[PDB]
Design an enzyme around this catalytic site. Structure first.
Site, PDB file in Angstrom:
ATOM      1  N   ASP A 174      87.407  23.172 -38.628  1.00 44.54           N
ATOM      2  CA  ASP A 174      86.700  22.388 -38.069  1.00 44.54           C
ATOM      3  C   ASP A 174      87.494  21.441 -38.356  1.00 44.54           C
ATOM      4  OD1 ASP A 174      85.172  19.353 -39.493  1.00 44.54           O
ATOM      5  OD2 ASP A 174      84.004  20.567 -38.457  1.00 44.54           O
ATOM      6  N   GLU A 200      87.792  24.514 -34.299  1.00 47.76           N
ATOM      7  CA  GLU A 200      86.949  23.778 -32.756  1.00 47.76           C
ATOM      8  C   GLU A 200      87.924  22.814 -32.224  1.00 47.76           C
ATOM      9  OE1 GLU A 200      85.466  20.711 -34.733  1.00 47.76           O
ATOM     10  OE2 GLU A 200      83.487  20.329 -33.961  1.00 47.76           O
TER      11      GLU A 200
HETATM   12  C1  LIG Z   1      81.160  15.424 -34.600  1.00 46.84           C
HETATM   13  C2  LIG Z   1      83.029  16.038 -33.485  1.00 46.84           C
HETATM   14  O1  LIG Z   1      83.045  14.243 -33.418  1.00 46.84           O
HETATM   15  C3  LIG Z   1      84.994  14.485 -32.216  1.00 46.84           C
HETATM   16  O2  LIG Z   1      84.320  15.255 -31.747  1.00 46.84           O
HETATM   17  C4  LIG Z   1      85.411  13.969 -30.444  1.00 46.84           C
HETATM   18  C5  LIG Z   1      83.441  13.047 -29.584  1.00 46.84           C
HETATM   19  C6  LIG Z   1      82.993  12.325 -31.009  1.00 46.84           C
HETATM   20  O3  LIG Z   1      81.889  12.223 -30.179  1.00 46.84           O
HETATM   21  O4  LIG Z   1      83.998  12.472 -28.514  1.00 46.84           O
HETATM   22  C7  LIG Z   1      84.884  13.304 -27.755  1.00 46.84           C
HETATM   23  O5  LIG Z   1      83.793  14.031 -27.312  1.00 46.84           O
HETATM   24  C8  LIG Z   1      82.976  13.862 -25.816  1.00 46.84           C
HETATM   25  C9  LIG Z   1      83.432  13.980 -24.972  1.00 46.84           C
HETATM   26  C10 LIG Z   1      84.148  15.449 -24.669  1.00 46.84           C
HETATM   27  O6  LIG Z   1      85.603  15.547 -23.618  1.00 46.84           O
HETATM   28  O7  LIG Z   1      82.728  13.657 -23.638  1.00 46.84           O
HETATM   29  C11 LIG Z   1      82.519  12.287 -23.534  1.00 46.84           C
HETATM   30  O8  LIG Z   1      81.629  11.847 -22.245  1.00 46.84           O
HETATM   31  C12 LIG Z   1      81.694  12.130 -24.615  1.00 46.84           C
HETATM   32  O9  LIG Z   1      80.831  11.093 -24.500  1.00 46.84           O
HETATM   33  C13 LIG Z   1      82.638  12.875 -25.982  1.00 46.84           C
HETATM   34  O10 LIG Z   1      81.434  12.206 -27.135  1.00 46.84           O
HETATM   35  C14 LIG Z   1      86.016  14.083 -28.277  1.00 46.84           C
HETATM   36  O11 LIG Z   1      87.120  14.237 -26.965  1.00 46.84           O
HETATM   37  C15 LIG Z   1      86.065  14.896 -29.556  1.00 46.84           C
HETATM   38  O12 LIG Z   1      86.808  15.664 -29.754  1.00 46.84           O
HETATM   39  C16 LIG Z   1      85.383  15.829 -33.254  1.00 46.84           C
HETATM   40  O13 LIG Z   1      86.378  15.985 -32.914  1.00 46.84           O
HETATM   41  C17 LIG Z   1      84.636  16.657 -33.652  1.00 46.84           C
HETATM   42  O14 LIG Z   1      85.756  18.039 -34.451  1.00 46.84           O
HETATM   43  C18 LIG Z   1      84.026  16.927 -35.004  1.00 46.84           C
HETATM   44  N1  LIG Z   1      82.618  17.698 -34.459  1.00 46.84           N
HETATM   45  C19 LIG Z   1      82.793  17.885 -36.225  1.00 46.84           C
HETATM   46  C20 LIG Z   1      84.431  17.692 -37.233  1.00 46.84           C
HETATM   47  C21 LIG Z   1      82.715  17.103 -38.506  1.00 46.84           C
HETATM   48  C22 LIG Z   1      83.685  16.210 -39.420  1.00 46.84           C
HETATM   49  O15 LIG Z   1      83.988  17.229 -40.768  1.00 46.84           O
HETATM   50  C23 LIG Z   1      81.552  17.563 -38.219  1.00 46.84           C
HETATM   51  O16 LIG Z   1      80.958  15.834 -38.068  1.00 46.84           O
HETATM   52  C24 LIG Z   1      79.918  15.412 -39.292  1.00 46.84           C
HETATM   53  O17 LIG Z   1      80.093  15.295 -40.394  1.00 46.84           O
HETATM   54  C25 LIG Z   1      80.515  13.494 -40.557  1.00 46.84           C
HETATM   55  C26 LIG Z   1      80.592  13.834 -41.578  1.00 46.84           C
HETATM   56  O18 LIG Z   1      79.476  13.788 -42.857  1.00 46.84           O
HETATM   57  C27 LIG Z   1      79.434  13.080 -40.201  1.00 46.84           C
HETATM   58  O19 LIG Z   1      79.606  11.446 -40.188  1.00 46.84           O
HETATM   59  C28 LIG Z   1      79.035  11.017 -41.311  1.00 46.84           C
HETATM   60  O20 LIG Z   1      79.912  10.560 -42.637  1.00 46.84           O
HETATM   61  C29 LIG Z   1      80.629   9.038 -41.682  1.00 46.84           C
HETATM   62  C30 LIG Z   1      81.562   8.710 -42.646  1.00 46.84           C
HETATM   63  C31 LIG Z   1      80.016   7.910 -41.188  1.00 46.84           C
HETATM   64  N2  LIG Z   1      80.325   7.368 -40.471  1.00 46.84           N
HETATM   65  C32 LIG Z   1      80.370   5.669 -40.826  1.00 46.84           C
HETATM   66  C33 LIG Z   1      81.275   5.236 -42.625  1.00 46.84           C
HETATM   67  C34 LIG Z   1      82.723   4.488 -42.309  1.00 46.84           C
HETATM   68  C35 LIG Z   1      83.351   3.473 -43.994  1.00 46.84           C
HETATM   69  O21 LIG Z   1      82.540   4.591 -45.358  1.00 46.84           O
HETATM   70  C36 LIG Z   1      83.069   3.456 -40.993  1.00 46.84           C
HETATM   71  O22 LIG Z   1      84.056   4.416 -41.502  1.00 46.84           O
HETATM   72  C37 LIG Z   1      81.908   4.556 -40.282  1.00 46.84           C
HETATM   73  O23 LIG Z   1      82.327   4.062 -39.324  1.00 46.84           O
HETATM   74  C38 LIG Z   1      80.336   4.739 -40.659  1.00 46.84           C
HETATM   75  O24 LIG Z   1      80.331   5.342 -39.482  1.00 46.84           O
HETATM   76  C39 LIG Z   1      78.889   8.233 -40.370  1.00 46.84           C
HETATM   77  O25 LIG Z   1      78.096   7.346 -39.815  1.00 46.84           O
HETATM   78  C40 LIG Z   1      78.122   9.275 -40.711  1.00 46.84           C
HETATM   79  O26 LIG Z   1      76.761   9.910 -39.750  1.00 46.84           O
HETATM   80  C41 LIG Z   1      79.117  13.207 -38.521  1.00 46.84           C
HETATM   81  O27 LIG Z   1      78.123  12.148 -37.873  1.00 46.84           O
HETATM   82  C42 LIG Z   1      78.541  14.168 -37.963  1.00 46.84           C
HETATM   83  O28 LIG Z   1      78.661  15.049 -36.732  1.00 46.84           O
HETATM   84  C43 LIG Z   1      81.104  17.555 -37.069  1.00 46.84           C
HETATM   85  O29 LIG Z   1      79.651  19.125 -37.153  1.00 46.84           O
HETATM   86  C44 LIG Z   1      81.927  19.032 -36.884  1.00 46.84           C
HETATM   87  O30 LIG Z   1      81.575  20.006 -36.451  1.00 46.84           O
HETATM   88 CL   LIG Z   2      81.637  25.286 -33.379  1.00 46.58          CL
END
Ligand SMILES: [C]=C1O[C](O[C]2[C]([C][O])O[C](O[C]3[C]([C][O])O[C]([O])[C]([O])[C]3[O])[C]([O])[C]2[O])[C]([O])[C]([O])[C]1[N][C]1[C]=C([C]=O)/C(=O\[C]2O[C]([C][O])[C](O[C]3OC(=[C])[C]([N][C]4[C]=C([C]=O)C(=O)[C]([O])[C]4[O])[C]([O])[C]3[O])[C]([O])[C]2[O])[C]([O])[C]1[O]
Ligand SMILES: [Cl-]
Ligand SMILES: [Ca+2]
EC number: 3.2.1.1
Length: 448
Positions: A174, A200
């Site tokens: 993440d 991501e």
């Molecule tokens: C969701 C995401 O975010 C980010 O992404 C970014 C975006 C933002 O919106 O921006 C941009 O994109 C787009 C572009 C493309 O090229 O196009 C344009 O046109 C548009 O406009 C835009 O939108 C950029 O490029 C991007 O990069 C980041 O990077 C990512 O990574 C994300 N996704 C992921 C991560 C995470 C973390 O682990 C998740 O998230 C969820 O969970 C959280 C925690 O629970 C929530 O939040 C909540 O809690 C917090 C603590 C709060 N804050 C509050 C408190 C305080 C003291 O204590 C203060 O400082 C602050 O300011 C306040 O506000 C909040 O409210 C709550 O709600 C969130 O919401 C959710 O979403 C996710 O799921 C993952 O998958």
């Molecule tokens: Cl994802």
């Protein structure tokens, strides 16, 4: 061959276990992306899961015993588990966690204030011109871990290695964009074996931090896929998709994780209205059929719940498997992975995995298309307002096949439950697809 996974968003461990046994395994889904299983803040919002308190396996989904049970049962059914892993931060503010642990002022059971970067806020303009702030400042107030620290890396790696010992096969990293790729490289050196890892990273172009930086550490989410597919299906011509993928500037197919929508973009968390979701009904069916039939990326089907316009709301107050009845398809769990066109698309992808080429592409210059996967399968989508009755060329053996989007082959292979499609002796098919409908056939659903 397993080719597709599914995100069972907010599904508890007992429901996932039963689903693996009763549906996912028999239908051929490869794995399940589960919601964060570690201790998180209390509260009913779905996003409480993204604010960790510790790495104890006590969460909204269930306790440690229930989690282990799920991994075992799923594994026995032939379905892997991928855990959503928080590698960038800990909870904001102060409070209590789901396992009873207290926290506050950047002080947790396993981290001290000195284990985090000095507090600063990631401003929207930082994404475009300040790599340092994107990676060292706070994402929406979440305590930013010093991911360059040997202690922090050992602590996260220990959690990941512990999960692998239980049987977990993959991980979603993440907020990877918010961690330097070099820090993720150091972390991976401490992780045992080679589990499946996907990061991501949202990159539509013009960002200070690009998705290409994460290709060496695992698969990466290709967000252009979701947005361009939605934009083409809603506002463009399907005929443009003849070269979808690298041809449109996307990352290499073998490095991409793709989807029609994910848990964030289906509710406006970084995703515009052009994204197609369950709310769009048949439009969603068709978008999924294209994704699953098309040979680009590793797709994940989304499985949601009707949030009734509240984008912060958690899931239904009733379990999926409720005393003998399935709480699917209505106003609680949507269960898109069970929708006939979607499950049919998964079956198609699974049975055409021996030919990754798009053969015999045909279109009407606009919203009618058809293509095959060599002699393994063929499909067609009609998004015009009139019936598609064109004759298309396929590489398939003549005979009768079940349209797998609408039914399936019987055990004795002597009948289908849905309409039958005929491949003539010259390999052509005389289509008969109504407006906003589709067909898909493959070599393993041929009548005898
Ligand atoms: C969701 C995401 O975010 C980010 O992404 C970014 C975006 C933002 O919106 O921006 C941009 O994109 C787009 C572009 C493309 O090229 O196009 C344009 O046109 C548009 O406009 C835009 O939108 C950029 O490029 C991007 O990069 C980041 O990077 C990512 O990574 C994300 N996704 C992921 C991560 C995470 C973390 O682990 C998740 O998230 C969820 O969970 C959280 C925690 O629970 C929530 O939040 C909540 O809690 C917090 C603590 C709060 N804050 C509050 C408190 C305080 C003291 O204590 C203060 O400082 C602050 O300011 C306040 O506000 C909040 O409210 C709550 O709600 C969130 O919401 C959710 O979403 C996710 O799921 C993952 O998958
Ligand atoms: Cl994802
Ligand atoms: Ca960071």
């Amino acid at each position: 061959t397993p080719t597709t996974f599914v995100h069972l968003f907010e599904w508890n461990w007992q429901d996932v276990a039963q689903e693996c046994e009763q549906y996912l395994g028999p239908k051929g889904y490869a794995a399940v992306q589960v919601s964060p299983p570690n201790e998180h803040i209390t509260g009913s919002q779905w996003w409480t899961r993204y604010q960790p308190v510790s790495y104890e396996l006590q969460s909204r989904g269930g306790n440690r015993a229930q989690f282990i049970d799920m991994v075992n049962r799923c594994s026995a059914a032939g379905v892997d588990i991928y855990v959503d892993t928080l590698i960038n931060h800990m909870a904001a503010g102060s409070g209590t966690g789901t396992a009873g642990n207290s926290f506050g002022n950047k002080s947790f059971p396993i981290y001290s204030p000195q284990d985090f970067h000095e507090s600063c806020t990631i401003n929207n303009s930082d994404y475009g011109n300040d790599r340092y702030r994107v990676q060292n400042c706070e994402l929406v107030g979440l305590a930013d871990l010093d991911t360059a620290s040997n202690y922090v890396q050992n602590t996260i790696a220990a959690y990941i290695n512990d999960l692998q010992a239980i049987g977990v096969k993959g991980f979603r990293f993440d907020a990877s964009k918010h961690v330097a790729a070099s820090d993720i490289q150091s972390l991976m050196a401490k992780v045992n074996g080679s589990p499946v890892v996907f990061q991501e990273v949202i990159d539509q172009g013009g960002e200070a931090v690009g998705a290409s930086e994460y290709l060496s550490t695992g698969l990466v989410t290709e967000f252009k896929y979701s947005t361009e597919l939605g934009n083409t299906f809603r506002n463009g011509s399907l005929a443009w998709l003849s070269n979808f993928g690298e041809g449109w500037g996307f990352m290499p197919s073998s490095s991409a994780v793709v989807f029609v929508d994910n848990h964030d973009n289906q509710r406006g968390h970084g995703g515009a209205g052009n994204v197609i979701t369950f709310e769009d009904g048949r439009l969603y069916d068709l978008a999924n059929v294209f994704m699953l039939a098309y040979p680009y990326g590793y797709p994940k089907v989304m499985s949601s719940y009707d949030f009734h316009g509240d984008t912060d709301a958690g899931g239904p107050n009733v379990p999926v498997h409720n005393n003998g009845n399935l709480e699917c398809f209505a106003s609680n769990w949507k269960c898109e992975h069970r929708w006939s066109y979607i499950a049919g698309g998964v079956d198609f992808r699974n049975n055409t995995a021996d030919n990754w080429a798009v053969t015999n592409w045909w279109d009407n210059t606009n919203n009618q298309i058809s293509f095959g996967r060599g002699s393994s399968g063929h499909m067609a989508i009609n998004k015009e307002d009139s019936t598609l009755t064109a004759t298309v060329q396929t590489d398939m053996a003549s005979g009768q096949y079940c349209n797998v989007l609408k039914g399936e082959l019987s055990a004795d292979a002597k009948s289908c439950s849905g309409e039958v499609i005929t491949v003539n002796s010259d390999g052509t098919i005389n289509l008969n697809i109504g407006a906003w409908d589709a067909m898909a056939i493959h070599k393993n659903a041929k009548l005898n």
